[PDB]
Design an enzyme around this catalytic site. Sequence first.
Site, PDB file in Angstrom:
ATOM      1  N   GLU A   1       7.709  -3.682  15.995  1.00  0.00           N
ATOM      2  CA  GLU A   1       7.468  -3.210  17.361  1.00  0.00           C
ATOM      3  C   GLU A   1       7.349  -4.461  18.219  1.00  0.00           C
ATOM      4  O   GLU A   1       7.464  -5.578  17.705  1.00  0.00           O
ATOM      5  CB  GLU A   1       6.150  -2.435  17.442  1.00  0.00           C
ATOM      6  CG  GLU A   1       5.882  -1.508  16.264  1.00  0.00           C
ATOM      7  CD  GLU A   1       6.982  -0.489  16.020  1.00  0.00           C
ATOM      8  OE1 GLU A   1       7.798  -0.221  16.926  1.00  0.00           O
ATOM      9  OE2 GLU A   1       7.024   0.057  14.906  1.00  0.00           O
TER      10      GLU A   1
ATOM     11  N   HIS B   1     -10.824   9.428  14.691  1.00  0.00           N
ATOM     12  CA  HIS B   1     -10.339   9.647  16.053  1.00  0.00           C
ATOM     13  C   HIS B   1     -11.304  10.512  16.872  1.00  0.00           C
ATOM     14  O   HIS B   1     -12.003  11.370  16.331  1.00  0.00           O
ATOM     15  CB  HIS B   1      -8.920  10.241  16.071  1.00  0.00           C
ATOM     16  CG  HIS B   1      -7.857   9.292  15.606  1.00  0.00           C
ATOM     17  ND1 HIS B   1      -6.795   9.684  14.820  1.00  0.00           N
ATOM     18  CD2 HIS B   1      -7.716   7.958  15.790  1.00  0.00           C
ATOM     19  CE1 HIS B   1      -6.027   8.638  14.566  1.00  0.00           C
ATOM     20  NE2 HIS B   1      -6.569   7.575  15.134  1.00  0.00           N
TER      21      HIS B   1
ATOM     22  N   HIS C   1      -1.748   1.119  11.008  1.00  0.00           N
ATOM     23  CA  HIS C   1      -2.707   1.939  10.290  1.00  0.00           C
ATOM     24  C   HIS C   1      -3.834   1.061   9.773  1.00  0.00           C
ATOM     25  O   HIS C   1      -3.679  -0.156   9.611  1.00  0.00           O
ATOM     26  CB  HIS C   1      -2.072   2.757   9.166  1.00  0.00           C
ATOM     27  CG  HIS C   1      -1.283   1.944   8.189  1.00  0.00           C
ATOM     28  ND1 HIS C   1       0.072   2.117   8.007  1.00  0.00           N
ATOM     29  CD2 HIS C   1      -1.654   0.949   7.348  1.00  0.00           C
ATOM     30  CE1 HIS C   1       0.499   1.275   7.083  1.00  0.00           C
ATOM     31  NE2 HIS C   1      -0.525   0.546   6.675  1.00  0.00           N
TER      32      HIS C   1
ATOM     33  N   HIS D   1     -11.370   1.927  13.107  1.00  0.00           N
ATOM     34  CA  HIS D   1     -11.152   2.583  11.828  1.00  0.00           C
ATOM     35  C   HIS D   1     -11.689   1.724  10.685  1.00  0.00           C
ATOM     36  O   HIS D   1     -12.319   2.233   9.765  1.00  0.00           O
ATOM     37  CB  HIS D   1      -9.663   2.849  11.568  1.00  0.00           C
ATOM     38  CG  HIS D   1      -9.046   3.871  12.469  1.00  0.00           C
ATOM     39  ND1 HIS D   1      -9.575   5.130  12.646  1.00  0.00           N
ATOM     40  CD2 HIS D   1      -7.884   3.851  13.167  1.00  0.00           C
ATOM     41  CE1 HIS D   1      -8.795   5.825  13.455  1.00  0.00           C
ATOM     42  NE2 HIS D   1      -7.761   5.071  13.785  1.00  0.00           N
TER      43      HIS D   1
ATOM     44  N   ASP E   1       0.864  -1.174   0.000  1.00  0.00           N
ATOM     45  CA  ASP E   1       0.000   0.000   0.000  1.00  0.00           C
ATOM     46  C   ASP E   1       0.907   1.232   0.000  1.00  0.00           C
ATOM     47  O   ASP E   1       2.121   1.094  -0.117  1.00  0.00           O
ATOM     48  CB  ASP E   1      -1.013  -0.034   1.153  1.00  0.00           C
ATOM     49  CG  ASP E   1      -0.358  -0.056   2.524  1.00  0.00           C
ATOM     50  OD1 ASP E   1       0.755   0.478   2.668  1.00  0.00           O
ATOM     51  OD2 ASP E   1      -0.975  -0.593   3.465  1.00  0.00           O
TER      52      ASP E   1
ATOM     53  N   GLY F   1      -9.612  -0.778   1.431  1.00  0.00           N
ATOM     54  CA  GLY F   1     -10.600  -0.310   2.392  1.00  0.00           C
ATOM     55  C   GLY F   1     -10.867  -1.359   3.452  1.00  0.00           C
ATOM     56  O   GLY F   1     -10.989  -2.541   3.136  1.00  0.00           O
TER      57      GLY F   1
ATOM     58  N   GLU G   1      -7.728   0.062  15.963  1.00  0.00           N
ATOM     59  CA  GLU G   1      -7.567  -0.086  14.513  1.00  0.00           C
ATOM     60  C   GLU G   1      -8.833  -0.594  13.832  1.00  0.00           C
ATOM     61  O   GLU G   1      -9.215  -0.114  12.763  1.00  0.00           O
ATOM     62  CB  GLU G   1      -6.395  -1.012  14.175  1.00  0.00           C
ATOM     63  CG  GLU G   1      -5.044  -0.508  14.676  1.00  0.00           C
ATOM     64  CD  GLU G   1      -4.668   0.856  14.119  1.00  0.00           C
ATOM     65  OE1 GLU G   1      -4.734   1.051  12.885  1.00  0.00           O
ATOM     66  OE2 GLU G   1      -4.270   1.731  14.918  1.00  0.00           O
TER      67      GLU G   1
END
Lengths: 159, 159, 159, 159
Positions: A103, A131, A85, A125, A72, A94, A122
Amino acid sequence: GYSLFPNSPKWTSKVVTYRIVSYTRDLPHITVDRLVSKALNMWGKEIPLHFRKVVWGTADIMIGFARGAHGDSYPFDGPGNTLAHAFAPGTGLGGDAHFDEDERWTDGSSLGINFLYAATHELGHSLGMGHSSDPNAVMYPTYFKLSQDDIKGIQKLYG
Amino acid sequence: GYSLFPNSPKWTSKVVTYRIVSYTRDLPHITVDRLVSKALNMWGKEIPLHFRKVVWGTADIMIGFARGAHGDSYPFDGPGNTLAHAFAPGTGLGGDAHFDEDERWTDGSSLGINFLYAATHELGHSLGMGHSSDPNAVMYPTYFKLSQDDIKGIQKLYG
Amino acid sequence: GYSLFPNSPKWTSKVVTYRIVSYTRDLPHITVDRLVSKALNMWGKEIPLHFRKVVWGTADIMIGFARGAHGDSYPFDGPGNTLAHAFAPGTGLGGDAHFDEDERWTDGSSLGINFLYAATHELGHSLGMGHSSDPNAVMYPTYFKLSQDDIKGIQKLYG
Amino acid sequence: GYSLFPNSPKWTSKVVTYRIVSYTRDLPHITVDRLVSKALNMWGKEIPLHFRKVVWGTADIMIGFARGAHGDSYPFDGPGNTLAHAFAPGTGLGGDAHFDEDERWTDGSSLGINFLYAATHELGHSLGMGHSSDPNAVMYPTYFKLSQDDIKGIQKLYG
Ligand SMILES: O=CN(O)[C@@H](CCCc1ncccn1)CS(=O)(=O)N1CCN(c2ccc(Br)cn2)CC1
Ligand SMILES: O=CN(O)[C@@H](CCCc1ncccn1)CS(=O)(=O)N1CCN(c2ccc(Br)cn2)CC1
Ligand SMILES: O=CN(O)[C@@H](CCCc1ncccn1)CS(=O)(=O)N1CCN(c2ccc(Br)cn2)CC1
Ligand SMILES: O=CN(O)[C@@H](CCCc1ncccn1)CS(=O)(=O)N1CCN(c2ccc(Br)cn2)CC1
Ligand SMILES: [Ca+2]
Ligand SMILES: [Ca+2]
Ligand SMILES: [Ca+2]
Ligand SMILES: [Ca+2]
Ligand SMILES: [Ca+2]
Ligand SMILES: [Ca+2]
Ligand SMILES: [Ca+2]
Ligand SMILES: [Ca+2]
Ligand SMILES: [Zn+2]
Ligand SMILES: [Zn+2]
Ligand SMILES: [Zn+2]
Ligand SMILES: [Zn+2]
Ligand SMILES: [Zn+2]
Ligand SMILES: [Zn+2]
Ligand SMILES: [Zn+2]
Ligand SMILES: [Zn+2]
């Protein structure tokens, strides 16, 4: 105050499929599987939307861990900086939720970013939540149950 | 509009050898082998050039994955940023195609940069193609078959 | 001249628990375990504070190695740059000592940052010591036994 | 024109010991061992200095691969950027040669920085050679046998 995405995209089908495409060496695959289900269900219980798990190919919500560039326009960057993300509902990218493999993720028993909380945020979203300005909200930009703001927002969008 | 390289370098021998020197942990070795062959053959079918695979030593087109500095003047940089590079036909580094190991590569069944598409683009460079101004072209600078522009360009160079 | 933390935080209980939560591939787990005990005991012998080791869940002093972001506001950054950090006594993150997995750590038999020295310094912070202006001190900002300055400081705080 | 180090440090003992402390996953341990011996011997044959290999503890010339910070004031930085460093003859860190694990190293059969050439250059530093202004020299700042300049320089120092 909760937020949605510009143009308020949402899943319009009765059933939305999801797939955990890639895992993390930080945790057992089954742990990630269970935590993802728990995260989705937290949102799911508040709305007329049903989630169906698929274990291969493409699903509406593609979930996974990746290192660096991964298909992406938001390549990960190694340890630190960007951590994850997710994209608003829609076709293709989408709804997808990506986590940076570089991490340290945990289920709570070790050091690391708590995966359940991160996944719930996440996946918010992935369902169309933006947010929140309310520090109590799971959708607050920075960091267990959904707050009144999260619930109000998701129900306003779905509904 | 397709482009070639300054001075229009091309392979001038009837047969060009290639070798997959190093692989990625993201995929089986055989998958990379098959996708590389498929990529080369996409270009190959349009021109009077034959490719011969070698499994050791030096070949005209050296293909591989690497982390960081790896023997040329374009060291990789970890996750993100530069993803791959390839050199125009010529001796030594000429024709070689390198991929950054620090990204996530896929054959299409998982998250990641699609290796077949990336390899077809990179190998285009290995054969003498530059970037195209036509968004439909595999040689377009940013991101299945070769477009009319790709075909026109490779045939103009070889032819 | 030794320093403490603003407001001079210290453990106020007779017993403080600690847990080694995550390890490094650079060394055996048992080596890290022994070196941590040795580090704590260096400080421990100078004060009326007792340490109790726990092998699961939460302990007052959480010790571990991590890559990148790991659940606090000081994500690690890959090889180099920040190497470790520890927090002054207090609840939650207070007292915890984190080490960046992306460096090379050693027990003295190989190349690397000497873990015993680093752990003794970090654990000094976990107990309430700040950095010293005395180059002889283990708590000096840059880099075997505690110096007179280290002893004076810890005893002044405890005591 | 060859160069030495300021104050022209050199090993003053008849015998200098060396140890390969850490290896790379890119190559067999024995390959690194043989290439290091070959590199040292290239310089050795030109001077009245003898090298003795040790497999444990400290040796005059400590050689190894490391990721990130590793016990000196020149931490490595991940893929790319700095690739290696070595220190002029002297006690402690003096004479040591470190290689960044985050690059790709090869013995010539794969992609990567050629270890033999890099080791010969680095070990030149370990013996007291600085960088040369002669592009033919192994000690030239950027990149098989020692050139006339390399030989002239090492013999001038020893001798
Ligand atoms: O969701 C992703 N985040 O917003 C990214 C930004 C991506 C921006 C982005 N969007 C799209 C494309 C590229 N980049 C920031 S994050 O640090 O990954 N995020 C902070 C909040 N955190 C919480 C917060 C509260 C709780 Br409770 C738990 N976890 C979840 C994770
Ligand atoms: O080929 C290499 N790229 O140009 C590099 C630049 C290297 C520049 C460079 N050249 C030489 C030396 C150093 N750096 C950019 S890339 O992001 O690696 N590239 C984008 C287009 N992508 C596509 C595009 C379309 C499709 Br379809 C599939 N994949 C293939 C890969
Ligand atoms: O302890 C942590 N350090 O201060 C960090 C800064 C973190 C700052 C920080 N604090 C809190 C949060 C974020 N960042 C710097 S460090 O390089 O990790 N530190 C240098 C001194 N070193 C020594 C010194 C002498 C000896 Br003997 C042995 N080792 C111990 C390790
Ligand atoms: O030796 C180390 N290098 O100089 C470092 C700089 C370290 C500077 C430094 N010094 C000390 C401390 C920190 N940093 C640069 S390097 O890129 O690692 N170096 C280039 C030349 N290369 C060659 C050249 C020719 C050939 Br033939 C083979 N290899 C050997 C390796
Ligand atoms: Ca990251
Ligand atoms: Ca999708
Ligand atoms: Ca890269
Ligand atoms: Ca070539
Ligand atoms: Ca670091
Ligand atoms: Ca704590
Ligand atoms: Ca490096
Ligand atoms: Ca030495
Ligand atoms: Zn992504
Ligand atoms: Zn978010
Ligand atoms: Zn390259
Ligand atoms: Zn290109
Ligand atoms: Zn931390
Ligand atoms: Zn400190
Ligand atoms: Zn070093
Ligand atoms: Zn050099």
